[PDB]
Design a protein around this ligand. Structure first.
Ligand SMILES: O=C1NC=C[C@H](O)N1
Ligand SMILES: O=C1NC=C[C@H](O)N1
Ligand SMILES: [Fe+3]
Ligand SMILES: [Fe+3]
Lengths: 423, 423
C-alpha cells in the first residue's frame, strides 16, 4: 500500500523529489529541500535515480533461448541466421514457444522492463508462434505491456501466401504490421511490400515497424519509402523503421537530403547495438565497418531514435540477459556518444525515446499517469551506465513487482573495506 | 544610326571583317584586306573581337542580392541553402523582388548579356516572385530577352499542391517547366515528377529545364529519364538538364552507356562552375571532389554543354558581378580545359552553346539576323579570357546599349609606362 516515493533524483532536475501515489497513479510530484525520513508506506529511493520503466522496443521472443538448435549460425550473418531459424521454426510447438518467451520475459521484469515489443515470424502457415505469443501477452499483462509485431520474416511478396498470412496475423490480434523489404527478391517487391504494409496498417488501425535495410548495401534505401508513405498518410507517430544499418554506408549527400524527409515524416528509428555490431560488417575484410545506423546525427537533428536488444540467445545472437543498460553501453561506444552529457542523456535511448517508438499513452513520471516507475541505485544516467547498476525496485500500478538486493564486495587489506566502485 | 561595324575579328576566322547594318539587322558581312578608316555611323571594333551577345542560361533572379537575410548558409550546402531561402521566401514582396532582379539585370546589361534564363521558385501558393518577374520580363525587354522557368524548388510531388502550382505558373506565362527530382522524397517521386514535367511542357508547348541530380550521389541518375523522355517525344532541342553534378561521381562504365543516349536525345546541359565548386564536395573530408559535370567529355562527344552563373549574392553564393568571362575562367580551371585551343574555344560555352540551350532563333553574326552583338577589346577568345576584359560596346537592334571605357594603368619607372597586360 505504497503512498510515496521519497528522496528521488530525476534526470535533468536538481535536488531530491517526492512522488505521491494514489489509487495506482502518481497524484503529485513535489521537490524536497533536504532528505526526508523513511516511514511506513514510503519507498525510499535513497537519493537514487527514479525514471519511468525501461522499454524493450525490439526483441524476438519467438526465437529466444534457441541458439544452436538444430545448428549454429557459423557465419554470424543475418542471412545464415534466417536459414538457421527456418530449421528451428519447423520444430516449433505451442508450449515450447510459451516456455521460452516467458523465461526471457522474467529476466525483463527483473531488469525493470515493463514495455516490450516483440516481433513474431508469420512466414508460417500454422502461425504456431503467433498463437502462443497471443496467450503469453495476456498472461504477462500484470507485469509487462507486450506489443506483437506480425513479422513476415521470409518476405511478403517473396514467400507463398505471404500477404495473406500477414493479414491473418492482424486479424488474430497482432498490434503492429511488420515487413522486410531488403529480403524480398527484388527492389520492386521491396517497395511494393511497403505499400501493402501501409495499406494493412490503415485498414486495421495498427502501428508499423519495418525491419528496414538491415544490410551493408549502400543501395538499400527502403527507409525513404517508409518515411514518405508515413508523411503522405500523416501517420509518422505510428511508424518505426528498425535497424536501417545500410544508412551507415550511405554517401553523405544522399543522407543529408534524406534527413529532411526523416524529420518531416516524424517516424521512429530503432538501432540494435549488440546485434548490429555482430551481424554487420561481416562481408568486409579490413577495415571493417561498425554498421549501426546514424544515431548521433539523428539525435542532433531531433529525430527520435532508441535502442533494442533484438535477440537473446538465438540464431542471431548467442549472448544476453535482456539488460537495457548493457544494450545502451554498447551503443554509446560504437556510435561514439562518449561525451559526458551524451552518456548521461543516454537513458533517454532506453526510456522516453522507446516509449515514443511504441506510441505509449501512459508513460513518464507525471501527475495523472499510472504509478509505473523504477529506482536505480545511482546518482544520474552517467553513473548508472558506468556501473551497470541493477534495478533496485520496479513499481507498477503503485506496487513493487521486482527488487534486487545489490551485491556486496569487500577487499581484505590491512582492514576490510567495502568497494562500491564510486568516486 | 550605326551603319557598319568595322575592323572586327571573328572567332575561328582569319583577318578583319566589316559588318553592315540595315534596319536593325545585319545586312551583310564582308572580309577586309586591311584596316578600314573610321567615319560617321561606323563603330570601330579596333581589331577587337566581335561576337553575338553573352548569354546567362541559368540564374535565380528571385533570390539575387539576398545573401544573409535572415541568416547565412553556414554549411555551404545546397540543402541548407534551400532552407535559408525558405526563410527569405516567406518575407518576399512584389517591389522587393523587382528591385533586386533589376539590380542584377543592370549588371548583366553592362556585361554584354542580352539573353537570360531565370528560374523562379514556384513552391509558394502566393507566387509572389513569379508575378513580379513577369513584369520585370516586360520592363527589361528592350535590353534583355528574359525567359522564366517555373521552378518547383521544394519538389512537385513532395510539396503541397506542387503540381497545381507548377501548372498555374505556366498558365500565368512561364516560358520553361522546371523540376528537381533529386530533392523529391523518393526515387519514385523523382521519376514520376519528370513524367509530369514533360506532360506539362507538351500540353503548353514550353521548354524544359530540370535542376537535375545536383548532388554528390552516384545513384542519382534522373538525367537518364530526362534524356529518354526527350528522345521519346522527339523534343531534345527544347530540353535542358541543369547541373548533373552527380555525373562527376558515376563509374565510367555507366557513364559510357549513358552518353550514347545523351547524344541521341539531343538535350542540352548547363554546368554552373562558380556555384558547383562551392556547393559540391561538401560531404567529403579529404580528398575532396570537384563536383562539376563531365563538361570535357561532353564537348569531345559533341553534346551541347554551356555555363551559367546560377547565383549572385544569395543563399547559395556570396559573390559575383554577373560576369560570364569570370564564370568561364572558373569552369576551364576546374574542368581542366586548359589547352590553348580549349581555352580559346571557351567562348562557345558562354555564347553559341548557351543560345542553343535557350532554343534561340535569332542569334549569331549572320546576314538576316537582328544586329545584336558585342565588342571585346581582345584579339581572340584566349586573350579575352586571360585578361578578363570588359565589354567595350554592346549593340542591340543596331544601337549601342552599353559601353565601357577601359581602365588605364600606368607604372612610374624611369619614365611613365602604360600597362595593358598584353604580350
Ligand atoms: O530479420 C531479422 N530477424 C531477427 C533478427 C534480426 O533483427 N533480423
Ligand atoms: O536547387 C537549387 N536552387 C538554387 C540554386 C541551385 O542551382 N540549386
Ligand atoms: Fe529484429
Ligand atoms: Fe539553379
Amino acid at each position: 500500500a505504497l503512498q510515496t516515493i521519497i528522496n528521488a533524483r530525476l534526470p535533468g532536475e536538481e535536488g531530491l523529489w517526492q512522488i505521491h501515489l494514489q489509487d495506482g497513479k502518481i497524484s503529485a510530484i513535489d521537490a524536497q529541500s533536504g532528505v526526508m525520513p523513511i516511514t511506513e508506506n514510503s519507498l525510499d529511493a535513497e537519493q537514487g535515480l527514479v525514471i519511468p520503466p525501461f522499454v524493450e522496443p525490439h526483441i524476438h521472443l519467438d526465437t529466444t533461448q534457441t541458439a544452436g538448435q538444430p545448428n549454429w549460425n557459423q557465419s554470424g550473418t543475418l542471412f545464415e541466421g534466417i536459414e538457421r531459424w527456418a530449421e528451428r521454426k519447423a520444430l516449433l510447438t505451442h508450449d515450447d514457444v510459451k516456455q521460452r518467451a516467458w523465461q526471457t520475459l522474467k529476466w525483463q521484469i527483473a531488469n525493470g522492463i515493463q514495455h516490450v515489443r516483440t516481433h513474431v515470424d508469420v512466414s508460417d502457415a500454422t502461425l504456431t508462434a503467433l498463437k502462443a505469443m497471443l496467450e503469453v501477452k495476456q498472461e504477462v499483462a500484470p507485469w509487462i505491456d507486450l506489443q506483437i509485431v506480425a513479422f513476415p520474416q521470409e518476405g511478403i511478396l517473396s514467400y507463398p501466401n505471404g500477404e495473406a498470412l500477414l493479414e491473418e496475423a492482424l486479424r488474430l490480434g497482432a498490434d503492429v504490421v511488420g515487413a522486410i523489404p531488403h529480403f524480398e527478391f527484388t527492389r520492386e517487391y521491396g517497395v511494393e511490400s511497403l505499400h501493402k504494409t501501409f495499406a494493412l496498417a490503415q485498414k486495421y488501425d495498427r502501428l508499423i515497424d519495418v525491419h528496414c535495410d538491415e544490410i551493408d548495401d549502400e543501395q538499400s534505401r527502403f527507409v525513404e519509402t517508409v518515411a514518405a508513405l508515413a508523411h503522405h498518410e500523416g501517420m509518422g507517430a505510428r511508424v518505426t523503421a528498425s535497424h536501417t544499418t545500410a544508412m551507415h554506408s550511405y554517401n553523405g549527400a544522399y543522407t543529408s537530403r534524406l534527413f529532411r524527409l526523416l524529420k518531416m515524416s516524424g517516424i521512429n528509428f530503432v538501432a540494435n547495438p549488440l546485434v548490429n555490431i555482430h551481424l554487420q560488417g561481416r562481408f568486409d575484410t579490413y577495415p571493417k565497418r561498425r554498421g549501426i545506423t546514424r544515431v548521433k546525427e539523428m539525435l542532433e537533428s531531433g529525430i527520435n531514435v532508441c535502442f533494442g536488444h533484438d535477440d537473446v540467445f538465438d540464431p542471431w545472437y548467442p549472448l544476453g540477459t535482456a539488460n537495457m543498460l548493457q544494450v545502451l553501453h554498447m551503443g554509446l561506444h560504437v556510435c561514439q556518444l562518449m561525451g559526458y552529457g551524451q552518456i548521461n542523456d543516454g537513458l533517454n535511448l532506453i526510456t522516453h525515446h522507446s516509449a515514443r517508438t511504441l506510441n505509449l499513452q501512459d508513460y513518464g513520471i507525471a501527475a495523472g499517469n499510472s504509478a509505473n516507475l523504477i529506482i536505480l541505485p545511482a546518482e544520474n544516467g552517467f553513473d548508472a551506465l558506468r556501473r551497470q547498476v541493477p534495478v533496485r525496485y520496479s513499481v507498477r500500478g503503485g506496487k513493487v513487482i521486482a527488487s534486487t538486493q545489490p551485491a556486496q564486495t569487500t577487499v581484505y587489506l590491512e582492514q576490510p573495506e567495502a568497494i562500491d566502485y564510486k568516486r
